[PDB]
Amino acid sequence: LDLETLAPYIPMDGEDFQL
Amino acid sequence: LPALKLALEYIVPCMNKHGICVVDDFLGKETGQQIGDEVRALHDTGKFTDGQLVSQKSDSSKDIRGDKITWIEGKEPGCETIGLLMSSMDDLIRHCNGKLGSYKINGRTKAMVACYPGNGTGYVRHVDNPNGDGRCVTCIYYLNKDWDAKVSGGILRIFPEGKAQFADIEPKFDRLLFFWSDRRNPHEVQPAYATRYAISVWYFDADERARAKVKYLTG
């Protein structure tokens, strides 16, 4: 049902890498 | 290989027409071997932990994905060749600026080094970014030398939306893969009966990622 229960986790708050 | 030609004449049209792109022999045998050595060094020293999900609920993560993963920035000691692979990925994406759909790509996650340790472990059918967490392109590098899919399995089966056929991606050595992360590309990692390695990166769309961060920071 809720597809986010199957999506691979990525850090959300964090930073992210900027290109 | 030269980034400009590969990006504009192959990757861009491939993604815009199919949403999936495969680039074999991306870095060469040597660099692939170094990357595999670094990945196996990470594995040998117990760096890998259970692969997690965006939304955790009553179910165990191993009922959804059987891989163990770690995150790499690219600058860590002993991860230099992984950093080189990451920089090559970024170079291609930069050369694709403003040509992949309507996306405006300005960043990416760290590199997820993932291992399915055989024993039939896999990943159930799923979508990488179903609820708009900012990811627009999934990029994966496979480094399994001597992999024989017909015996060891581990095929990444993608079900591109609206297509009369699905795409089977064998985790072939030195293979690079791009595909839209949203619901257009549901995919599954079929059971693996040998140690299967991959390195994944998710590139963000600026506006969608900004909205996702706004949602997260506001509860």
Curated annotation (Swiss-Prot), chain A:
<feature type="modified residue" description="4-hydroxyproline">
    <location>
        <position position="8"/>
    </location>
</feature>
<comment type="subunit">
    <text>(Microbial infection) Interacts with Kaposi's sarcoma-associated herpesvirus/HHV-8 protein ORF34; this interaction results in increased stability of EPAS1 and thus activation of its transcriptional activity.</text>
</comment>
<protein>
    <recommendedName>
        <fullName>Endothelial PAS domain-containing protein 1</fullName>
    </recommendedName>
</protein>
<comment type="function">
    <text>Transcription factor involved in the induction of oxygen regulated genes. Heterodimerizes with ARNT; heterodimer binds to core DNA sequence 5'-TACGTG-3' within the hypoxia response element (HRE) of target gene promoters. Regulates the vascular endothelial growth factor (VEGF) expression and seems to be implicated in the development of blood vessels and the tubular system of lung. May also play a role in the formation of the endothelium that gives rise to the blood brain barrier. Potent activator of the Tie-2 tyrosine kinase expression.</text>
</comment>
<comment type="subunit">
    <text>Interacts with HIF3A. Efficient DNA binding requires dimerization with another bHLH protein. Heterodimerizes with ARNT; heterodimer binds to core DNA sequence 5'-TACGTG-3' within the hypoxia response element (HRE) of target gene promoters. Interacts with CREBBP. Interacts with EGLN1. Interacts with VHL.</text>
</comment>
Curated annotation (Swiss-Prot), chain B:
<feature type="binding site">
    <location>
        <position position="187"/>
    </location>
    <ligand>
        <name>Fe cation</name>
    </ligand>
</feature>
<comment type="function">
    <text>Cellular oxygen sensor that catalyzes, under normoxic conditions, the post-translational formation of 4-hydroxyproline in hypoxia-inducible factor (HIF) alpha proteins. Hydroxylates a specific proline found in each of the oxygen-dependent degradation (ODD) domains (N-terminal, NODD, and C-terminal, CODD) of HIF1A. Also hydroxylates HIF2A. Has a preference for the CODD site for both HIF1A and HIF1B. Hydroxylated HIFs are then targeted for proteasomal degradation via the von Hippel-Lindau ubiquitination complex.</text>
</comment>
<dbReference type="GO" id="GO:0043231">
    <property type="term" value="C:intracellular membrane-bounded organelle"/>
</dbReference>
<keyword id="KW-0479">Metal-binding</keyword>
<keyword id="KW-0223">Dioxygenase</keyword>
<feature type="domain" description="Fe2OG dioxygenase">
    <location>
        <begin position="104"/>
        <end position="205"/>
    </location>
</feature>
<keyword id="KW-0539">Nucleus</keyword>
<dbReference type="GO" id="GO:0099159">
    <property type="term" value="P:regulation of modification of postsynaptic structure"/>
</dbReference>
<dbReference type="GO" id="GO:0045944">
    <property type="term" value="P:positive regulation of transcription by RNA polymerase II"/>
</dbReference>
<feature type="modified residue" description="S-nitrosocysteine">
    <location>
        <position position="14"/>
    </location>
</feature>
<dbReference type="GO" id="GO:0031545">
    <property type="term" value="F:peptidyl-proline 4-dioxygenase activity"/>
</dbReference>
<dbReference type="GO" id="GO:0140252">
    <property type="term" value="P:regulation protein catabolic process at postsynapse"/>
</dbReference>
<keyword id="KW-0408">Iron</keyword>
<feature type="binding site">
    <location>
        <position position="126"/>
    </location>
    <ligand>
        <name>Fe cation</name>
    </ligand>
</feature>
<dbReference type="GO" id="GO:0071731">
    <property type="term" value="P:response to nitric oxide"/>
</dbReference>
<dbReference type="GO" id="GO:0045765">
    <property type="term" value="P:regulation of angiogenesis"/>
</dbReference>
<dbReference type="GO" id="GO:0060711">
    <property type="term" value="P:labyrinthine layer development"/>
</dbReference>
<dbReference type="GO" id="GO:0005737">
    <property type="term" value="C:cytoplasm"/>
</dbReference>
<dbReference type="GO" id="GO:0060347">
    <property type="term" value="P:heart trabecula formation"/>
</dbReference>
<keyword id="KW-0863">Zinc-finger</keyword>
<feature type="binding site">
    <location>
        <position position="196"/>
    </location>
    <ligand>
        <name>2-oxoglutarate</name>
    </ligand>
</feature>
<dbReference type="GO" id="GO:0016706">
    <property type="term" value="F:2-oxoglutarate-dependent dioxygenase activity"/>
</dbReference>
